[PDB]
Design a protein around this ligand. Structure first.
Ligand SMILES: NC[C@@H]1O[C@H](O[C@H]2[C@@H](O)[C@H](O[C@@H]3[C@@H](O)[C@H](N)C[C@H](N)[C@H]3O[C@H]3O[C@H](CO)[C@@H](O)[C@H](O)[C@H]3N)O[C@@H]2CO)[C@H](N)[C@@H](O)[C@@H]1O
Ligand SMILES: [Mg+2]
Ligand SMILES: [Mg+2]
Ligand SMILES: [Mg+2]
Ligand SMILES: [Mg+2]
Ligand SMILES: [Mg+2]
Ligand SMILES: [Mg+2]
Ligand SMILES: [Mg+2]
Ligand SMILES: [Mg+2]
Ligand SMILES: [Mg+2]
Ligand SMILES: [Mg+2]
Ligand SMILES: [Mg+2]
Ligand SMILES: [Mg+2]
Ligand SMILES: [Mg+2]
Ligand SMILES: [Mg+2]
Ligand SMILES: [Mg+2]
Ligand SMILES: [Mg+2]
Ligand SMILES: [Mg+2]
Ligand SMILES: [Mg+2]
Ligand SMILES: [Mg+2]
Ligand SMILES: [Mg+2]
Ligand SMILES: [Mg+2]
Ligand SMILES: [Mg+2]
Ligand SMILES: [Mg+2]
Ligand SMILES: [Mg+2]
Ligand SMILES: [Mg+2]
Ligand SMILES: [Mg+2]
Ligand SMILES: [Mg+2]
Ligand SMILES: [Mg+2]
Ligand SMILES: [Mg+2]
Ligand SMILES: [Mg+2]
Ligand SMILES: [Mg+2]
Ligand SMILES: [Mg+2]
Ligand SMILES: [Mg+2]
Ligand SMILES: [Mg+2]
Ligand SMILES: [Mg+2]
Ligand SMILES: [Mg+2]
Ligand SMILES: [Mg+2]
Ligand SMILES: [Mg+2]
Ligand SMILES: [Mg+2]
Ligand SMILES: [Mg+2]
Ligand SMILES: [Mg+2]
Ligand SMILES: [Mg+2]
Ligand SMILES: [Mg+2]
Ligand SMILES: [Mg+2]
Ligand SMILES: [Mg+2]
Ligand SMILES: [Mg+2]
Ligand SMILES: [Mg+2]
Ligand SMILES: [Mg+2]
Ligand SMILES: [Mg+2]
Ligand SMILES: [Mg+2]
Ligand SMILES: [Mg+2]
Ligand SMILES: [Mg+2]
Ligand SMILES: [Mg+2]
Ligand SMILES: [Mg+2]
Ligand SMILES: [Mg+2]
Ligand SMILES: [Mg+2]
Ligand SMILES: [Mg+2]
Ligand SMILES: [Mg+2]
Ligand SMILES: [Mg+2]
Ligand SMILES: [Mg+2]
Ligand SMILES: [Mg+2]
Ligand SMILES: [Mg+2]
Ligand SMILES: [Mg+2]
Ligand SMILES: [Mg+2]
Ligand SMILES: [Mg+2]
Ligand SMILES: [Mg+2]
Ligand SMILES: [Mg+2]
Ligand SMILES: [Mg+2]
Ligand SMILES: [Mg+2]
Ligand SMILES: [Mg+2]
Ligand SMILES: [Mg+2]
Ligand SMILES: [Mg+2]
Ligand SMILES: [Mg+2]
Ligand SMILES: [Mg+2]
Ligand SMILES: [Mg+2]
Ligand SMILES: [Mg+2]
Ligand SMILES: [Mg+2]
Ligand SMILES: [Mg+2]
Ligand SMILES: [Mg+2]
Ligand SMILES: [Mg+2]
Ligand SMILES: [Mg+2]
Ligand SMILES: [Mg+2]
Ligand SMILES: [Mg+2]
Ligand SMILES: [Mg+2]
Ligand SMILES: [Mg+2]
Ligand SMILES: [Mg+2]
Ligand SMILES: [Mg+2]
Ligand SMILES: [Mg+2]
Ligand SMILES: [Mg+2]
Ligand SMILES: [Mg+2]
Ligand SMILES: [Mg+2]
Ligand SMILES: [Mg+2]
Ligand SMILES: [Mg+2]
Ligand SMILES: [Mg+2]
Ligand SMILES: [Mg+2]
Ligand SMILES: [Mg+2]
Ligand SMILES: [Mg+2]
Ligand SMILES: [Mg+2]
Ligand SMILES: [Mg+2]
Ligand SMILES: [Mg+2]
Ligand SMILES: [Mg+2]
Ligand SMILES: [Mg+2]
Ligand SMILES: [Mg+2]
Ligand SMILES: [Mg+2]
Ligand SMILES: [Mg+2]
Ligand SMILES: [Mg+2]
Ligand SMILES: [Mg+2]
Ligand SMILES: [Mg+2]
Ligand SMILES: [Mg+2]
Ligand SMILES: [Mg+2]
Ligand SMILES: [Mg+2]
Ligand SMILES: [Mg+2]
Ligand SMILES: [Mg+2]
Ligand SMILES: [Mg+2]
Ligand SMILES: [Mg+2]
Ligand SMILES: [Mg+2]
Ligand SMILES: [Mg+2]
Ligand SMILES: [Mg+2]
Ligand SMILES: [Mg+2]
Ligand SMILES: [Mg+2]
Ligand SMILES: [Mg+2]
Ligand SMILES: [Mg+2]
Ligand SMILES: [Mg+2]
Ligand SMILES: [Mg+2]
Ligand SMILES: [Mg+2]
Ligand SMILES: [Mg+2]
Ligand SMILES: [Mg+2]
Ligand SMILES: [Mg+2]
Ligand SMILES: [Mg+2]
Ligand SMILES: [Mg+2]
Lengths: 272, 49, 9
RNA sequence: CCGAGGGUAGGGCCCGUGACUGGGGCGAAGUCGUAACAAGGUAGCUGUACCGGAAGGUGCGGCUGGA
RNA sequence: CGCGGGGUGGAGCAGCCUGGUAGCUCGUCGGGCUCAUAACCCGAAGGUCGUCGGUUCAAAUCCGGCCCCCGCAACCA
RNA sequence: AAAAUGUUCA
RNA sequence: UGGUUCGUGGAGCCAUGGGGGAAUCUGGGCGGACCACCGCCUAAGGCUAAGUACUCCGGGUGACCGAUAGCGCACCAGUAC
RNA sequence: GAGCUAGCCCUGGCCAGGGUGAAGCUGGGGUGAGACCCAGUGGAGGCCCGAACCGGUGGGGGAUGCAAACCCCUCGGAUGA
RNA sequence: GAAUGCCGGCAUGAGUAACGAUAAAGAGGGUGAGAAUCCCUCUCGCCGUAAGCCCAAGGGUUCCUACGCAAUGGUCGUCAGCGUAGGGUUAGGCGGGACCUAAGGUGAAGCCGAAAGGCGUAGCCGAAGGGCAGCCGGUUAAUAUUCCGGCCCUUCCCGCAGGUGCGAUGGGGGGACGCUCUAGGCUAGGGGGACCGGAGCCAUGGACGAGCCCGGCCAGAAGCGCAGGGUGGGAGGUAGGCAAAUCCGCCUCCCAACAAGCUCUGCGUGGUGGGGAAGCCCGUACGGGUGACAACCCCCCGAAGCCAGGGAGCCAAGAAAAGCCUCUAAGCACAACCUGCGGGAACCCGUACCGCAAACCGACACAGGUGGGCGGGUGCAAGAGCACUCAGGCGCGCGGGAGAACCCUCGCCAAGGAACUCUGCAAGUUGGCCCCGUAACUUCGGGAGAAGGGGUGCUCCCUGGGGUGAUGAGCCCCGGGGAGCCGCAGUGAACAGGCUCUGGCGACUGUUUACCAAAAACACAGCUCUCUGCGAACUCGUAAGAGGAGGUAUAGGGAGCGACGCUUGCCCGGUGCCGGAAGGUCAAGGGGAGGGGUGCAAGCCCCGAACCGAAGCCCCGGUGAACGGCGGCCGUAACUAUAACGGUCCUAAGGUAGCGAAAUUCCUUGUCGGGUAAGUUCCGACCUGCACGAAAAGCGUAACGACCGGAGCGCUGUCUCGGCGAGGGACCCGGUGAAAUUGAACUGGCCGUGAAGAUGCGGCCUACCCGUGGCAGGACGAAAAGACCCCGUGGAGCUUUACUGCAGCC
RNA sequence: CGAUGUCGGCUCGUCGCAUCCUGGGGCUGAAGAAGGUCCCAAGGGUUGGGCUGUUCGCCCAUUAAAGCGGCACGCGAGCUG
């Protein structure tokens, strides 16, 4: 839906906030299962190695369930859907009859009170997790494992999915959010449905501060700098570059393919 | 204005203390040099309890 | 002193 | 007290005027091209969109005031 | 002032560096086709090559001096 | 298959 | 590739990182590419005084200084600052 | 050497008093149901005035200064990057 | 004898500048060898969201006291923060540690690295964060939540008395958290009082009065009382909480849905304890006595503080661990644990004093810097603002005279109002609140405090709402209406926008050159391009490792543009990037035609042609929101003029829209038009654009601006054009007393001359010796071995299709 | 070049005359008035604005006239910037 504001201030005239109506009466989270201390820090042991990180709201990590094959066969009741500061998506709090409480990343269409479960069994319904094989060709799916028993790694961003395209002996072909065509092992779990919160892309930050709230420090142009700092630094009053556009570290930034050629992963990929 | 000396007993101790110098080869040599020199004070005297 | 002023005037 | 009126400030409607600019009307025999009327030599017209010295061209849908 | 590029039939351009041979398009002229014009077709004419010098057996062509034309430069005070 | 034009008034 | 006077030089010898990979005296390395001949040695295990270097320390001497010199310090100096 | 300074991390503190009056609520109106409109409530904001506080715009003084960046008048922000 | 030489010493300027805020001093009396400066009294001024109190950091004897003045004090000094000596810092409850965990540090296992070393889950360390039991008075010259007095708590250990399956570093719960706004009841704090208590006081015209003045509390266990915070009670089933659980979690039936009940705080009350003014009398360098049997009560305002883990709303979604409760396991249940009561035990370090400053950071008794808490009263709408003033603390460690110039800081001015000037720079006008009233434009919010105005004090009368009180008196808040009074003037003092029109740039709040640039630079939301399938790309590190990210294409890295609106054209030849299992070239290596050297020979040893040989380059395509680029010359229309139209050469293609003398326009003050008496500027136009132009974006855009330009009104000392006055200096006297500089000096003008700008040489002229206050023409004045410039086969930063390497990648 | 601060403005001036005005004079194609030109003469005087950093210049309103130069394109230990 997206919340919109009137221009009672500049920067409030474009600004735009998510709709939280799917956030069920459960705004503060769940101890026990999560949260952990989350360790803010824009850099490695010592030095900054990703520029322009820092500031922005304190967070608690929700330790979510990315391998659903523990509770094969054990169903769970979806108890709530809550805000997760550390991902684009929303998260489902679910209660297993087992007693155990996990969070699942919350798919589009998930309703509270719903039944959900994981395993070879598993009715093909939104919320359920299955090894890729038993899932019908053509159904859209998410939180897909890359290699079996290694955890969900594909399609967890808000409003993303992959679609099952066909099969090939032990592998089923996937069409990933990027549009790539991937052979992913049959035995990999993946949960049916799309991610949801799909209006995430429609949000307009609206002002500088908002950027900072999310811990995004000001990014400065190479043009703004000096020859010591950047290939684009200097010279006089503005300058068009004077070389093929580059990163600060000298590599070209328009076109230069960067995936290494001889990756053994290659023989499992069929697209862009 | 604000000058450059902003005394702190903990800082002076953690920074220039006998135990800091002892911790690394760089520092151990400092004690060696100061000893051979005949320095009355190997490290700065940080006070208080 | 140590300068550090540049030769202006 | 009110008060003709004068003063100060700020709006509204109308008239006149202005370097320049826009298209228009009209003025026998100036220029360029051929759009339309015959199937006008690409049927025409059309709303819209883009483009082109100019009529105009073309895309999409429509019409018979054409086959 | 300095630099380097150019004047070739009526118009716009080749031809030079490896000297002896001036060609292309348009235009012009004569003839056709058309009722007539253009378009189109067949023929033809037209160049002291900016000048002054000489280098050579021979100069559009190579070398000097002027004459216009075009472009670049004139910085630090 | 391609083919433009015909000064003004009677 | 390093070492040797040897800077690829005709470049050996001595070390070695990589690859291949023997032999036990009729076996093996060397005498400056290489081959022959003639000779010198016996690798891939280790220990070994003395002669040599040095002067914190003790002593002796001086065509060494004599308090701006001689060590930074002749004096409670690596102090005061 | 980051006790100045730059950034980030962890944990605390601070921001007088005034204004302006968004969403949303409640009532009324309207409609087939709506959209929407009126109040009333509400208290939003890199919102406004303005101390503390953080600054350093303009001018004057200062120039072996009170001061190796100060002082006077004036001025920017002041619930947020 | 020289090196702007080095060390030291002493001169010069010089009794000159200065003596550190313009908050301010006068006098009497002491003490003393000696007093503007020390002690005391009186008078005066200054601070009072401090220039007053209390901590933290830091400082380390500065604290108190005795005796002292050589030096330190910008003067003096009998004084001191200085010298000599002595004295002073008391804790189970405050803080820190025998408690906990955060970032981070360290680090067993383990991984890595030529060595030194680097990483690293557990654990440990690590603190104004979590946890934790003292409040109020009294004493010292100097310490007190520490000693003492009263009242009240905390742990251990050993006992008795009784309760129960007790019981782990293990499980679970709790602890436990954001921002903004907030309700109810309290306390701190404050105002008032005809009531209570007090020494006193009638002055100078009047007042013996419900008169003036001063003061009317604090702490306090249990139990209450009032606020409020926490929390459902059962019974079954159970596969999860990494062993086990009765616990928790998940189901299913009952009763509650209430704070009824359990507890937990806060506040009142409380056995009792303590305090207790003005004034007067005393002797202090200060404290004491009395006032006292002191009284110790009633209203009112009221928090940002307490009840606290309260409530509501919002998005950016808001530490951990232990104490604490509980569950069980090994063990053991003559243990052990819990409740109650007794006795006993309760360590280590800090405590002085400064603490917005003369004791900390600035070489100084330095006008600067320095974190937290309290910060009273009145009035001005409020308030931590502003003026004065409680308490408290100061008059800033040189003074005394004088009444010049000139400077600083400030007040006022005839008439004119910007004529000043690069510019209204500066200074003035305006100014608070309440109420009328407000334009273009606009993204519908704004522009708005538009602009422009009126009201503002005091007296009396009438009157409407609340709040606390019972539905009332009072006390406290908002109002309305009507008469009237005075002054030049009613936010009468102090704090408090000048306004408008129109361009340029940037959307905007923001950020920036600490120490000359705050902007149109940077950033910014947003747009696009590109990279990246996750052991991601990218980055740091030799590596291990880590960031990215405990993220996963709505994600992350790089680049450009920089809200928004309308848009962003043509060129892929060159350069870059992307795509091409062909072809050309291609290094090691494979391959050996064949040749060479030695050998009597088998052999040993050299070279070495075909051919097989990757990437890269070539080559073939693609690609401009990739690096970039986007023409010239002639002719032509029935007045001329101009050229829709034509020819031609060249290119990879020959700048479209929109804009244009521009932050771009050289010729240039282009030419018209506007504003002005007059306008190299400014605005609007024309287009001949030296040399605009579409994401190094193009043209516009409401709002916004310590940005830049133009104009106008208002208003002025900016000016015409100055004048007067104030104080701080200057000046004189007493005291203390520098500096840069300096070859030496007995240092005149002119005209000449001289290395070409003479006090010093020549000629003439003028001029008794020496100071003080001033002015700056000169001593090519001072200060810095010229920053410009050039030189040196001097040095650095940067660049690239300069050379040669290296990382990285292939 | 071990430093001579470099434009213009303000301020304060002073000097040369090859004079802008005023005084005196010759010639005039000088009727008069008003001009033209040359000689003598510097004693004194030589405005205020708009524009521009400007010097200069162009303008507006005047005037007896709106003089020209030198003095380190006079004058920054005088100011401005
Ligand atoms: N008046 C007609 C409107 O204006 C235009 O028409 C104007 C012109 O286009 C037109 O020009 C014509 C031209 O078309 C035609 N081929 C040649 C003719 N000689 C011209 O004529 C014009 O110019 C001449 C002067 O020389 C005048 O005398 C005459 O009046 C005038 N019509 O003359 C018209 C003025 O009267 C549009 N073309 C027409 O379609 C429109 O409806
Ligand atoms: Mg926890
Ligand atoms: Mg690192
Ligand atoms: Mg480290
Ligand atoms: Mg940027
Ligand atoms: Mg820059
Ligand atoms: Mg660079
Ligand atoms: Mg440029
Ligand atoms: Mg560049
Ligand atoms: Mg009009
Ligand atoms: Mg036709
Ligand atoms: Mg047709
Ligand atoms: Mg047609
Ligand atoms: Mg159409
Ligand atoms: Mg077309
Ligand atoms: Mg220069
Ligand atoms: Mg025709
Ligand atoms: Mg006809
Ligand atoms: Mg006729
Ligand atoms: Mg060698
Ligand atoms: Mg060998
Ligand atoms: Mg040998
Ligand atoms: Mg030999
Ligand atoms: Mg041998
Ligand atoms: Mg001797
Ligand atoms: Mg001697
Ligand atoms: Mg010595
Ligand atoms: Mg010595
Ligand atoms: Mg409302
Ligand atoms: Mg508000
Ligand atoms: Mg604000
Ligand atoms: Mg403000
Ligand atoms: Mg700053
Ligand atoms: Mg000599
Ligand atoms: Mg000197
Ligand atoms: Mg000396
Ligand atoms: Mg003097
Ligand atoms: Mg003097
Ligand atoms: Mg003096
Ligand atoms: Mg003083
Ligand atoms: Mg005495
Ligand atoms: Mg006062
Ligand atoms: Mg002492
Ligand atoms: Mg003392
Ligand atoms: Mg003294
Ligand atoms: Mg002093
Ligand atoms: Mg004494
Ligand atoms: Mg003392
Ligand atoms: Mg404690
Ligand atoms: Mg102990
Ligand atoms: Mg610990
Ligand atoms: Mg840790
Ligand atoms: Mg470590
Ligand atoms: Mg500890
Ligand atoms: Mg604590
Ligand atoms: Mg138990
Ligand atoms: Mg626990
Ligand atoms: Mg009387
Ligand atoms: Mg009590
Ligand atoms: Mg279990
Ligand atoms: Mg008493
Ligand atoms: Mg709450
Ligand atoms: Mg622990
Ligand atoms: Mg436990
Ligand atoms: Mg104490
Ligand atoms: Mg104390
Ligand atoms: Mg004390
Ligand atoms: Mg303070
Ligand atoms: Mg002082
Ligand atoms: Mg001070
Ligand atoms: Mg402060
Ligand atoms: Mg207060
Ligand atoms: Mg007020
Ligand atoms: Mg104040
Ligand atoms: Mg006046
Ligand atoms: Mg007047
Ligand atoms: Mg006026
Ligand atoms: Mg003017
Ligand atoms: Mg003027
Ligand atoms: Mg101006
Ligand atoms: Mg001003
Ligand atoms: Mg403006
Ligand atoms: Mg503007
Ligand atoms: Mg801006
Ligand atoms: Mg700003
Ligand atoms: Mg600066
Ligand atoms: Mg500045
Ligand atoms: Mg600014
Ligand atoms: Mg990683
Ligand atoms: Mg991570
Ligand atoms: Mg990206
Ligand atoms: Mg930009
Ligand atoms: Mg920009
Ligand atoms: Mg821009
Ligand atoms: Mg191509
Ligand atoms: Mg190209
Ligand atoms: Mg290309
Ligand atoms: Mg390629
Ligand atoms: Mg190849
Ligand atoms: Mg483009
Ligand atoms: Mg123009
Ligand atoms: Mg330009
Ligand atoms: Mg004009
Ligand atoms: Mg004009
Ligand atoms: Mg441009
Ligand atoms: Mg561009
Ligand atoms: Mg004046
Ligand atoms: Mg005075
Ligand atoms: Mg004196
Ligand atoms: Mg003399
Ligand atoms: Mg001379
Ligand atoms: Mg002489
Ligand atoms: Mg002389
Ligand atoms: Mg002088
Ligand atoms: Mg000098
Ligand atoms: Mg020099
Ligand atoms: Mg050289
Ligand atoms: Mg050198
Ligand atoms: Mg020089
Ligand atoms: Mg000199
Ligand atoms: Mg004369
Ligand atoms: Mg005459
Ligand atoms: Mg003007
Ligand atoms: Mg001007
Ligand atoms: Mg000049
Ligand atoms: Mg003169
Ligand atoms: Mg000159
Ligand atoms: Mg000059
Ligand atoms: Mg100056
Ligand atoms: Mg001078
Ligand atoms: Mg300037």
């Amino acid at each position: 839906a997206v919340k919109k504001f009137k221009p009672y201030t500049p920067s409030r005239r474009f600004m735009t906030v998510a709709d939280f109506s799917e956030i069920t009466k459960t705004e503060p989270e769940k101890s026990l299962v999560k949260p952990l201390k989350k360790t803010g820090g824009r850099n490695n042991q010592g030095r900054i190695t990703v520029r322009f990180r820092g500031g922005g709201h304190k967070r608690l990590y929700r330790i979510i369930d990315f391998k659903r094959w523990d509770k094969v066969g054990i169903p769970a009741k979806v108890a709530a859907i809550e805000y997760d500061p550390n991902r684009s998506a929303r998260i489902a709090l679910l209660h297993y009859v087992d007693g155990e409480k996990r969070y699942i990343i919350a798919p589009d269409g998930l309703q509270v009170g719903q039944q959900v479960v994981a395993g070879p069994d598993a009715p093909i319904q939104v919320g359920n997790a299955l090894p890729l094989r038993f899932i019908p060709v053509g159904t859209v799916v998410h939180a897909v494992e890359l290699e079996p028993k290694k955890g969900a790694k594909l399609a967890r961003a808000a409003g993303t999915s992959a679609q099952i395209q066909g099969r090939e002996g032990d592998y089923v072909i996937l069409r990933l959010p990027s549009g790539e065509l991937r052979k992913v092992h049959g035995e990999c779990y993946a949960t049916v449905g799309a991610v949801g919160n799909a209006d995430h892309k429609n949000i307009v930050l609206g002002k500088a501060g908002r950027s900072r709230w999310l811990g995004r420090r000001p990014h400065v142009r190479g043009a703004a700098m000096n020859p010591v700092d950047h290939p684009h630094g200097g010279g006089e009053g503005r300058a068009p570059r004077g070389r093929p556009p580059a990163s600060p570290w000298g590599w070209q930034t328009k076109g230069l393919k960067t995936r290494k050629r001889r990756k053994p992963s290659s023989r499992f990929i069929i697209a862009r | 204005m604000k000058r450059t000396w902003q005394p702190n007993r903990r800082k002076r101790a953690k920074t220039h203390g006998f135990r800091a110098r002892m911790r690394t080869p760089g520092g151990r040599k400092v004690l060696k040099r100061r000893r051979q020199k005949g320095r009355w004070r190997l490290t700065p005297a940080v006070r208080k309890r | 002193x140590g300068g550090p002023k540049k030769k202006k005037k």
